[PDB]
Amino acid sequence: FIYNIATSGAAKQLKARSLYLDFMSEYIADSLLDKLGLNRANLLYVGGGHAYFVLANTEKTVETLVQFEKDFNQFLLANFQTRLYVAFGWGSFAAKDIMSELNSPESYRQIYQKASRMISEKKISRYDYRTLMLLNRGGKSSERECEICHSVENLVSYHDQKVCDICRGLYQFSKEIAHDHFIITENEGLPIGPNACLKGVAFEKLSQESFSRVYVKNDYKAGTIKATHVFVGDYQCDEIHKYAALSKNEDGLGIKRLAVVRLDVDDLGAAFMAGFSRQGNGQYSTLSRSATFSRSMSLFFKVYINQFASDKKLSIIYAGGDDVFAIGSWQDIIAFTVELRQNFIKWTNGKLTLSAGIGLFADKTPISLMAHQTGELEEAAKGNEKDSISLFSSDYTFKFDRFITNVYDDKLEQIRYFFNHQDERGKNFIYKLIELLRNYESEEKMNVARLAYYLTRLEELTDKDERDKFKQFKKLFFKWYTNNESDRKEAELALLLYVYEIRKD
Amino acid sequence: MTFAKIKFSAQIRLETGLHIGGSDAFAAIGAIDSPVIKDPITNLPIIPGSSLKGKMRTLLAKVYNEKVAEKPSDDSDILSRLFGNSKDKRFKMGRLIFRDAFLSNADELD
Amino acid sequence: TYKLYIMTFQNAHFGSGTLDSSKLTFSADRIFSALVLEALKMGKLDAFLAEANQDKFTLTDAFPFQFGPFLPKPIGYPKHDQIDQSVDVKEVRRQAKLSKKLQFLALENVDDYLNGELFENEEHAVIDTVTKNQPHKDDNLYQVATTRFSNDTSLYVIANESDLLNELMSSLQYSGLGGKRSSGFGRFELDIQNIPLELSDRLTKNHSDKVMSLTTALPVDADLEEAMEDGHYLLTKSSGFAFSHATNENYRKQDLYKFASGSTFSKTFEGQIVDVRPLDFPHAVLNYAKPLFFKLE
Amino acid sequence: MAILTDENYVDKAERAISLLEKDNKGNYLLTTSQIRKLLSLCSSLYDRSKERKFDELINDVSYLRVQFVYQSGRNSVRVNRQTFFPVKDLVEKGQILEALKEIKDRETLQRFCRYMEALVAYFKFYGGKD
Amino acid sequence: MTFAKIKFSAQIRLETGLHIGGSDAFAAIGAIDSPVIKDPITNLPIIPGSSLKGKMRTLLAKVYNEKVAEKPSDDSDILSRLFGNSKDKRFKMGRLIFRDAFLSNADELDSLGVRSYTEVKFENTIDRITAEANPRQIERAIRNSTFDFELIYEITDENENQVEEDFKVIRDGLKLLELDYLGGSGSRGYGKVAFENLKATTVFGNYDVKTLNELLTAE
Amino acid sequence: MTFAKIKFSAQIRLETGLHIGGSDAFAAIGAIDSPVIKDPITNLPIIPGSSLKGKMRTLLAKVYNEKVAEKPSDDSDILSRLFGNSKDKRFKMGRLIFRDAFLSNADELDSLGVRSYTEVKFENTIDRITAEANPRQIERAIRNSTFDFELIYEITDENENQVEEDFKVIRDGLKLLELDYLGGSGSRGYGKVAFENLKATTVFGNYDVKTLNELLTAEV
């Protein structure tokens, strides 16, 4: 739902959809708690559409659970058709199985397990016979469609463009994201639930609107209005169509391209389930430890990422749980990815690793295609025994620590230090270097010969004062080229990054 | 104002002989003499326009400069305007185009 | 039920709803519409319609074919009765993610997967996107995703041995399938093979056991409730703009939600060649949702 | 026995280059200006072998062998009150005349040309001047 | 007269470096600032069928269009009945099914002794007031590379009296494309192609391609 | 009015060693040189159509502009409609198509006993104060090499006066290229070219080129 956008203005719709789905999950949790007469204390985790509650085991609770399930699925079928579907599960457990003198680590997990199996079963079998018979009724003669999500329901004209009611709502909501307060009204705004709509309104107007629930985004101060506090990663430096031009520096250096980073923490679910059972023979497995692990993950990925994005030309579209999605200038994007993982390694003491994919794209490219290619690169990185980074291609997949220690600050720094002092011919020799790097497997010994020749001819072409530093670089690059394929690929990536930095066009 | 081209055409007659130079790439197998520059096809001696331009510029630099002229790019208005100057946007392309001089009276010499 | 129609592709674009997306395999509705259009443009539309309306006619979704008939992952059978393991939760989640990532099994090991064995995907095709422009007003820039196959991977479909269907297939192999057919994407070469002896005994249309649909089929109202009350399934939208020669303007043909493959059911059912034409327009749009099942253990 | 095979000529060029003669200051006496004509002839013969049959390239191989023999003994350097022949020892150590004798088809010609290219690349790699 | 399909097999042989270009995801990492479009798998230069179709349509728009073609939708009946037209009844889908073009002499190129299948052309621009040279690099599918060109024209009962005019249109498109460039910076010596072994064969159905081949080749 | 395409076919015969030049990164394994560009298939020197187009446009900008041009996009109507401007809507597609000029008489050169199609010219630079000779060597094409030159001119909606003017401009461009140097160090005797067997044949459409051929043979 978030990433399927096909037209210009995808930026504002994208961020508005991300915030709107986060608020829809928050509203699901809040309304379910209100129907049970509980509060946010019973809420263990909300993030990425995944949420956990601890409730009283009674027939009344089960009946309200199934009733709210049916009501919210009916609302989602009415508004979003089959695009969004909520699935509820619940597993009965006793007090005994959450202690440490009485919990069985199997039982500990079993508590959560049942609910996962029931949710998966309800996800497999979605709708009954009435629902699909109604959805298949057809009978509509339509010549035009929505141009963003290709919906046919309730098309309206906007900016000479046909959009559905939900697209019009996200159009309106994108201008209202800048406010801090979001209200739940009965009819005004984007439909967030059964007879309930979300609307972002500024503080000074809050007294003039009738609401039932108020959310405050990224605020730790108890204000004059009794509200519920939610946290999202929503740093925005500029509009998305400008990041292609923003990559260039004041001197005109830098490729006119943008980048998208998708990052994921490996085995976060296994971390939740059995990360604490390895020590103490499974005695450290209580709901308290899972709850503080959830809170620490939320603290790192919902507020701290905003500081990691500070002063950088990027926008964090989606940051919740383990998935991070940001779009920006490529230099600031890669920078931000490196800093985020370094600080994640320092935060988790090296227990949880990260896999990142950084796709490089041109200006005006569709956002769905962006997300798809960057997710493919992220999966390719996930394939390299995890803890890996995939830069611009599945070919350049590296262990992440190797990427920081060897690619960025070791090879790229030396390449910068050298070629910043060189004229046009030396800078042009980078392309021959890259071509020799790519062709090594076919003609190994002839290629090492050719590379030796090219390095020493540039030796002989360098001035007498600058000869010795060239001898150092030639020895170092020959060592990289003849050592192994890993250093070969690392040097190739460093050369590619450097030629991206200096490009005048 | 209007565009025109004037072609100074002359015949260079060698009062004494001429050793332009070049390296031993067309030197005969067994010859130890210092070779003169030659056409790669006919192997007749030629006078490259580079030598004419260099010697003319060096000679005129002692007459139309009244300065030091440490380097070729430092030459005056009157010389950089004709022979070109790499460090002046108004005189990067000079108005003088020299041409390689090739033998013409080979039949008469024979 | 009779043949093992294989089609070698080199470049194809089967849209998933947007022009910038391209699926690996096409659904049965696409190939049925292609055949109907080929029969209409050749002249013998009524013969193909009569053959399709008969219960002997069969068609399945495109499945990969690489040195052996491959098949859809059965939805709902990683069942814990054969998946109970004593490994730690890290390995449990790793194998669950591997199973969820799997999309096509090989016929040689389908029962093996039903026994609890774990398998991985295989290099079939690369989904690449190429950007093109319109230099007539110099203000256009579109992107098309393709599915260039390699590793000698073809696609196969299961249809009856009939002279009409074979002729339409041979005419279709130089017309392309899906996407920008008059731009390069979609072409294929046809071959006709016999069903292997390990498949024909299970490729079925009627028992009462558990049968994987091998087609994006939509049951009639008589047995839909019995289909979903004890069934595992997936839902796919067959929406789109109806290609037609009798309108100057494109019309959105009616949306349809169909059971994908492989949806497992407790029994067989009957499909539908459903009319999804917008109101008041003489010639209709036919959507083929008719089951071809696979018997399981 | 073939002196130049597809899997050893680069290693042979290395061994030849590392074994060349030297003076007291540790500089190569051979320079690329001495073997420039041979390099140009080898390159021209290489790009003429791509589209032209060997049966009408015997004159070029003959001239190339004549030039190698000539440049072996033409140039010399006077050091330490004795005369050195750099191209002569390069030919003797690299077995250039032996690879030239065995040139019989197109593949051997191109292999010899690539061997000469490896020889000059390696000579420049180890401090060979111009 | 009944269904037929006619296939115009040919071998495009680049006489000058081709620069169809279009680096997006795979070719985008080319480090050249203008990479040619390649195959995602074998990294082989490719002439996409869209380039051939667009160039042929734009070339025939100057011969078989009596009115000025303000838009491709307003093209003449002859062009719109072959290349297609989105905004009409009869001509919604064209009669021409282009195919991509793949390298077919890669082994021959290896035999010649090439190391890469795409050279790098270095160019520059000279300012007029000043004279500083700004250099640049652009990839080029090297010459003497052959691509399999395969275009199919469909013959339908209703569209039968127009077969000869259509055949003349394909002839005039293929031999105009042989005179104009094929993609790239063609006005600076680029994309010069030649259709060798230009042969038309009926494939599905039956037709007298024997009268077409003699007027196709040679003249 | 109608559509026609005319092919100017000639042989660019050099008279001094042309040196168009390439990049040291992609040069051969040989010694220090400023190499010409070569075809990757045969390694023979070529004359790209970009060099001819640039030199012809620069030379015709001194004759057909009536005002100095800061940029190529600021040229006159004639040069715009012939060569092409990206900033002009009606002249986006130039009507002049240049082609790369590959080596033509390699058989004749081989018959003349030549052994290489590129020579090495050795020069030096001597300081005006110290008179020290710093040497150099650069690469040149052989003097009497010929190259196939093909230039295609397209006739669309162009009046007879317009096509005659374009023919005159093309003739003046070829004459100016003869009187100037093709790309390289031509101020020192490089790139002097002459067009041999210059003629125009209508390859497409029907257009009369008898008088155009007569004036092409006369003016040359």
PDB file of C-alpha atoms in Angstrom, chain A residues 443 445-446 448-450 452-453 455-457 460 467 474 478, chain D residues 9-11 114 117-118 120-122 124-126 128-130:
ATOM      1  CA  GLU A 443      42.797 -13.286 -18.660  1.00  0.00           C
ATOM      2  CA  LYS A 445      48.111 -13.237 -15.890  1.00  0.00           C
ATOM      3  CA  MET A 446      47.816 -11.024 -18.993  1.00  0.00           C
ATOM      4  CA  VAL A 448      48.098  -8.473 -14.007  1.00  0.00           C
ATOM      5  CA  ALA A 449      50.724  -7.669 -16.667  1.00  0.00           C
ATOM      6  CA  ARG A 450      48.587  -4.951 -18.162  1.00  0.00           C
ATOM      7  CA  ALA A 452      51.541  -3.431 -13.866  1.00  0.00           C
ATOM      8  CA  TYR A 453      52.264  -1.659 -17.156  1.00  0.00           C
ATOM      9  CA  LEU A 455      50.675   1.679 -13.032  1.00  0.00           C
ATOM     10  CA  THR A 456      54.311   2.143 -13.987  1.00  0.00           C
ATOM     11  CA  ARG A 457      53.541   4.208 -17.075  1.00  0.00           C
ATOM     12  CA  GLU A 460      56.874   7.613 -15.371  1.00  0.00           C
ATOM     13  CA  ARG A 467      56.856  10.338  -7.762  1.00  0.00           C
ATOM     14  CA  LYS A 474      51.212   1.606  -7.168  1.00  0.00           C
ATOM     15  CA  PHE A 478      49.134  -3.989  -7.008  1.00  0.00           C
TER      16      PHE A 478
ATOM     17  CA  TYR D   9      54.522 -17.061 -21.244  1.00  0.00           C
ATOM     18  CA  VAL D  10      53.686 -14.390 -18.673  1.00  0.00           C
ATOM     19  CA  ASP D  11      55.711 -16.282 -16.056  1.00  0.00           C
ATOM     20  CA  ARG D 114      51.341 -11.193 -26.316  1.00  0.00           C
ATOM     21  CA  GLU D 117      53.696  -7.269 -24.584  1.00  0.00           C
ATOM     22  CA  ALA D 118      54.073  -9.073 -21.249  1.00  0.00           C
ATOM     23  CA  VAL D 120      57.667  -4.902 -21.970  1.00  0.00           C
ATOM     24  CA  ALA D 121      54.975  -4.584 -19.252  1.00  0.00           C
ATOM     25  CA  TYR D 122      57.161  -6.400 -16.741  1.00  0.00           C
ATOM     26  CA  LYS D 124      58.445  -1.297 -17.093  1.00  0.00           C
ATOM     27  CA  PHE D 125      57.152  -2.769 -13.820  1.00  0.00           C
ATOM     28  CA  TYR D 126      60.645  -3.296 -12.378  1.00  0.00           C
ATOM     29  CA  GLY D 128      62.792   0.068 -16.696  1.00  0.00           C
ATOM     30  CA  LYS D 129      63.321   3.639 -17.924  1.00  0.00           C
ATOM     31  CA  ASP D 130      62.370   5.201 -21.256  1.00  0.00           C
TER      32      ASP D 130
END
